[PDB]
Amino acid sequence: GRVKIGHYILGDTLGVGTFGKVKVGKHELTGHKVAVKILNRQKIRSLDVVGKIRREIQNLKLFRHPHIIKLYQVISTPSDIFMVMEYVSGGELFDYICKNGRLDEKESRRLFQQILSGVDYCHRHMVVHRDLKPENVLLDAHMNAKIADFGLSNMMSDGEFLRTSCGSPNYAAPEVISGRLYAGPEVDIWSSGVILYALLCGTLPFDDDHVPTLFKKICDGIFYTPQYLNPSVISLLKHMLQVDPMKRATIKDIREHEWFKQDLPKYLFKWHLGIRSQSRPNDIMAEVCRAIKQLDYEWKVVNPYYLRVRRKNPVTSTFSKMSLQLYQVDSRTYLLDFRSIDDSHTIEFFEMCANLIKILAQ
Amino acid sequence: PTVFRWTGGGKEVYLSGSFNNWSKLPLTRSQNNFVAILDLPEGEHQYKFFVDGQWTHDPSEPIVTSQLGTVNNIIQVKKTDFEVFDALMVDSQKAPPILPPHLLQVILNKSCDPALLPEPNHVMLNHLYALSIKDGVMVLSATHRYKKKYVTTLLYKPI
Amino acid sequence: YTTFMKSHRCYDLIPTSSKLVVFDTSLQVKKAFFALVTNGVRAAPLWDSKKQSFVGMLTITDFINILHRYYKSALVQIYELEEHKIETWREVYLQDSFKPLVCISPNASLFDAVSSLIRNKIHRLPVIDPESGNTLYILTHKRILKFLKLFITSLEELQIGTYANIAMVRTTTPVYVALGIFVQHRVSALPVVDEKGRVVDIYSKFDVINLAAEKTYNNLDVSVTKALQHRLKCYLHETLEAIINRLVEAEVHRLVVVDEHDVVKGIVSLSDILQALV
Ligand SMILES: O=C(O[C@@H]1O[C@H](C(=O)O)[C@@H](O)[C@H](O)[C@H]1O)c1c[nH]c2cc(F)c(-c3ccc([C@@H]4CCCCO4)cc3)c(F)c12
Ligand SMILES: Nc1ncnc2c1ncn2[C@@H]1O[C@H](COP(=O)(O)OP(=O)(O)O)[C@@H](O)[C@H]1O
Ligand SMILES: Nc1ncnc2c1ncn2[C@@H]1O[C@H](COP(=O)(O)O)[C@@H](O)[C@H]1O
Ligand SMILES: Nc1ncnc2c1ncn2[C@@H]1O[C@H](COP(=O)(O)O)[C@@H](O)[C@H]1O
Ligand SMILES: [Cl-]
Numbered sequence: 001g002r003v004k005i006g007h008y009i010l011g012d013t014l015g016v017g018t019f020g021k022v023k024v025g026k027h028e029l030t031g032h033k034v035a036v037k038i039l040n041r042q043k044i045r046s047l048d049v050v051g052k053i054r055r056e057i058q059n060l061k062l063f064r065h066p067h068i069i070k071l072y073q074v075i076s077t078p079s080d081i082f083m084v085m086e087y088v089s090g091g092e093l094f095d096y097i098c099k100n101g102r103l104d105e106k107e108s109r110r111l112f113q114q115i116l117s118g119v120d121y122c123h124r125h126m127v128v129h130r131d132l133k134p135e136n137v138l139l140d141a142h143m144n145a146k147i148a149d150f151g152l153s154n155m156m157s158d159g160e161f162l163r164t165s166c167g168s169p170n171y172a173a174p175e176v177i178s179g180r181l182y183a184g185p186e187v188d189i190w191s192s193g194v195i196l197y198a199l200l201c202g203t204l205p206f207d208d209d210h211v212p213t214l215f216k217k218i219c220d221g222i223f224y225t226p227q228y229l230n231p232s233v234i235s236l237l238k239h240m241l242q243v244d245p246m247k248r249a250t251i252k253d254i255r256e257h258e259w260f261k262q263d264l265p266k267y268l269f270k271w272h273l274g275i276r277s278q279s280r281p282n283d284i285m286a287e288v289c290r291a292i293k294q295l296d297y298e299w300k301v302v303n304p305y306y307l308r309v310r311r312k313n314p315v316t317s318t319f320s321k322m323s324l325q326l327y328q329v330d331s332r333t334y335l336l337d338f339r340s341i342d343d344s345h346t347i348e349f350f351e352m353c354a355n356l357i358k359i360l361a362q
Numbered sequence: 363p364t365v366f367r368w369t370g371g372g373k374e375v376y377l378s379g380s381f382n383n384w385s386k387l388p389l390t391r392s393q394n395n396f397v398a399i400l401d402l403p404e405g406e407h408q409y410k411f412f413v414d415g416q417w418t419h420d421p422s423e424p425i426v427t428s429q430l431g432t433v434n435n436i437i438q439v440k441k442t443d444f445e446v447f448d449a450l451m452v453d454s455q456k457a458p459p460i461l462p463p464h465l466l467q468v469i470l471n472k473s474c475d476p477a478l479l480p481e482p483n484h485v486m487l488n489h490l491y492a493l494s495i496k497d498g499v500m501v502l503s504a505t506h507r508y509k510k511k512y513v514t515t516l517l518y519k520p521i
Numbered sequence: 522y523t524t525f526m527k528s529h530r531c532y533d534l535i536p537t538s539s540k541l542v543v544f545d546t547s548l549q550v551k552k553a554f555f556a557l558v559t560n561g562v563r564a565a566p567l568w569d570s571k572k573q574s575f576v577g578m579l580t581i582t583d584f585i586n587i588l589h590r591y592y593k594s595a596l597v598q599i600y601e602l603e604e605h606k607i608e609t610w611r612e613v614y615l616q617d618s619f620k621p622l623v624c625i626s627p628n629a630s631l632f633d634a635v636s637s638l639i640r641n642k643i644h645r646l647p648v649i650d651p652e653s654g655n656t657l658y659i660l661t662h663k664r665i666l667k668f669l670k671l672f673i674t675s676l677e678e679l680q681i682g683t684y685a686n687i688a689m690v691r692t693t694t695p696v697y698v699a700l701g702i703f704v705q706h707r708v709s710a711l712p713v714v715d716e717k718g719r720v721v722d723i724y725s726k727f728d729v730i731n732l733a734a735e736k737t738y739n740n741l742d743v744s745v746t747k748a749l750q751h752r753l754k755c756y757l758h759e760t761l762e763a764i765i766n767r768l769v770e771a772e773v774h775r776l777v778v779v780d781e782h783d784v785v786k787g788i789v790s791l792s793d794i795l796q797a798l799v
């Protein structure tokens with residue numbers, strides 16, 4: 001009377017992830033254990049995440065890092081999708097820090113190097129696991145970090161920003177709580193910074209029951225450094241938890257940091273953008289729309305500020321695509337951004353833009 | 363391998379089906395969900411449930427009523443349901459944003475080769491940048507990646 | 522050495538991140554030369570908007586040519602240089618003679634690249650990707666040789682270089698005159714020689730852009746020495762491995778093959794070195 005999938009007999013539920021239930025699987029013959037994520041096809045289509053999952057599987061099946069949970073196999077059934085993964089007996093890093101207190105400088109550094117190694121591997125693979133927290137860092141028998149819920153993760157694509165506000169308010173970057181556009185790695189760096197504080201202190205840097213003050217505190221980048229903290233790691237944290245993404249640490253800057261480097265194992269590791277106008281956003285969009293048509297160009301209005309435009313080459317008889325986007329700079333100025341859409345392509349893009357600019361504002 | 367799940371309470375729940383000559387197969391309960399996974403040959407199968415003394419079907423699931431008035435559930439175990447990417451493919455059937463600071467980080471402004479340049483953040487690739495129009499000649503520029511290398515091309519164009 | 526080039530792709534020599542200056546043929550030719558200087562580039566591919574293709578390349582040779590073909594005097598403006606488009610000039614430069622665009626794919630071999638250079642008698646080879654049609658990089662002898670020399674782990678016995686009818690200038694020779702030699706002889710550099718046959722300096726195709734740079738081209742009556750004020754030998758009894766090492770170590774485009782008494786006997790160009798190794 002055992003529920004089996006693969007040759008693993010499904011047992012106890014380890015938890016409930018982003019998109020599914022996670023159950024233990026112990027092999028019929030060998031006793032080998034796996035973590036099985038159950039994704040009901042009807043639910044993964046109700047939330048329109050079918051595409052999300054397709055990509056998520058694609059990435060994770062080819063990934064292989066010692067501090068990222070291995071995705072062994074994906075078993076499809078008419079009903080649901082079974083994601084067979086590597087199981088780790090130690091559970092959450094979060095409960096570790098609950099049960100035992102904060103980790104010692106040495107122990108903290110080890111685990112931080114391990115996590116960051118994994119975080120880096122993801123980024124090196126144009127994957128950004130947003131929602132990076134002790135709750136999603138699992139531990140194995142031998143105390144090794146294992147990055148786990150890629151449900152909120154996204155792809156990093158050349159020339160494009162992400163928008164989705166994702167993780168736990170505490171671990172979430174200020175721009176994520178601010179709901180501003182972001183590149184991707186900087187928000188994983190911030191979350192990893194929160195993880196470092198959690199390891200060294202055993203508490204959260206930014207935390208309050210009063211949600212408004214929690215968000216002020218996060219956006220003010222102010223956290224308490226207890227006297228027992230080594231000034232060098234305080235240096236690293238001050239760098240990692242920069243409210244300005246442009247001023248924030250990078251996996252490179254961290255890798256170069258003295259605190260990090262220590263005992264680190266071998267196995268791990270006058271140009272102007274677009275055109276700017278001070279007019280009303282709706283007047284700007286109207287102007288650019290009556291300019292695109294004035295060039296006999298095909299287009300498709302996505303957002304009231306995003307437009308995907310096409311042009312037929314009068315010579316080579318080829319289709320060339322680009323996307324236009326209005327961003328706000330000052331409280332009084334806005335700028336239209338031109339981005340090339342990949343199927344001379346580059347020169348044709350310049351030409352396409354140039355035409356539009358001569359018939360436009362600053 | 364097909365999943366047979368009964369959502370709803372019960373002390374004892376069984377699965378009778380064409381695939382097992384209508385024999386009562388016990389379904390294990392975790393909580394509120396009674397399940398059994400079993401591989402069935404690709405094709406049509408009819409099943410019913412024996413939920414605490416009552417023979418029922420999952421009404422949420424497709425049925426079939428017999429010439430004799432028998433109402434059983436039906437299942438079409440398709441080839442497509444077995445392969446993940448095939449199954450996922452068959453499944454898929456205001457104010458302006460603030461300017462990200464990233465787009466203001468160029469590689470042309472920031473002894474050495476004038477040809478050589480720093481590596482860019484993926485985020486600023488394919489974006490159009492331009493110099494102020496001096497002498498009635500426009501200068502446009504952009505960084506594009508070709509494989510594992512990058513090229514910042516700048517066009518000198520009259521207007 | 523030669524079989525090494527046949528294996529390695531052009532891509533393997535394209536840098537991690539480079540700058541590519543492209544001129545529209547409708548651009549004023551004076552602005553086009555000033556752009557080479559301002560950008561710190563020696564050549565630029567030309568794009569014809571009406572043709573929708575890369576028609577050719579603008580090099581310092583083009584400047585040398587314009588200057589010599591149209592220099593009236595120091596008291597008279599070069600009207601053609603001041604007010605000519607790149608196409609209006611390419612229409613003149615090449616008329617009864619037609620030299621189409623030479624290019625290479627990034628997936629093509631380094632051997633194919635070395636050949637393309639000598640075969641078409643050229644110094645700048647643009648690497649264009651076929652699917653994108655985008656020019657990525659411009660292949661120069663210096664870079665291809667620097668790559669060969671990276672993987673390398675007498676000049677009289679092998680006989681490599683030009684040793685007969687060597688085109689060189691006197692100390693006092695005006696720039697215009699020297700420009701005329703660069704044109705009729707079609708050679709990259711003119712060794713500056715003293716009263717006696719010995720060499721004191723070398724005026725090269727490069728030293729000609731300083732005129733664009735300093736905006737001093739309106740006086741070509743100046744001696745080659747006056748011209749060189751703004752800012753290397755090899756003897757016949759020296760091994761080619763050492764002579765190849767010397768060129769890349771000093772990053773120079775050609776060495777002077779001189780006798781004991783510092784008197785010119787020939788020249789050995791990067792062109793000839795890569796050619797002999799093909
Ligand atoms: O639980 C599921 O969905 C949830 O249903 C909730 C609801 O309806 O109440 C909603 O609220 C939730 O949102 C939803 O995620 C499932 C969807 N597909 C499945 C496929 C399965 F195989 C199993 C399953 C596998 C093994 C055992 C065995 C049984 C014996 C003990 C050890 O586990 C029990 C059950 C499942 F549980 C599911
Ligand atoms: N790829 C090319 N295809 C055809 N002609 C070219 C190409 N590149 C340059 N040319 C032409 O070759 C001539 C000489 O150029 P070049 O030898 O490259 O000069 P430099 O020594 O400064 O590199 C010029 O007339 C130039 O327009
Ligand atoms: N001053 C010169 N006089 C004669 N031949 C030369 C001179 N400079 C270069 N050459 C030759 O010109 C050819 C092409 O080389 P280059 O234009 O110098 O890259 C080679 O065969 C060189 O040896
Ligand atoms: N044989 C040489 N000896 C010394 N300097 C040289 C030599 N050949 C070229 N140069 C210098 O290199 C510069 C021009 O570069 P290029 O024409 O590319 O070789 C000038 O400053 C020349 O003086
Ligand atoms: Cl949970």
Ligand SMILES: [Cl-]
Nearest residue numbers: 011026031033
């Ligand atoms: Cl057990």
Ligand SMILES: [Cl-]
Nearest residue numbers: 088089140141
């Ligand atoms: Cl374990």
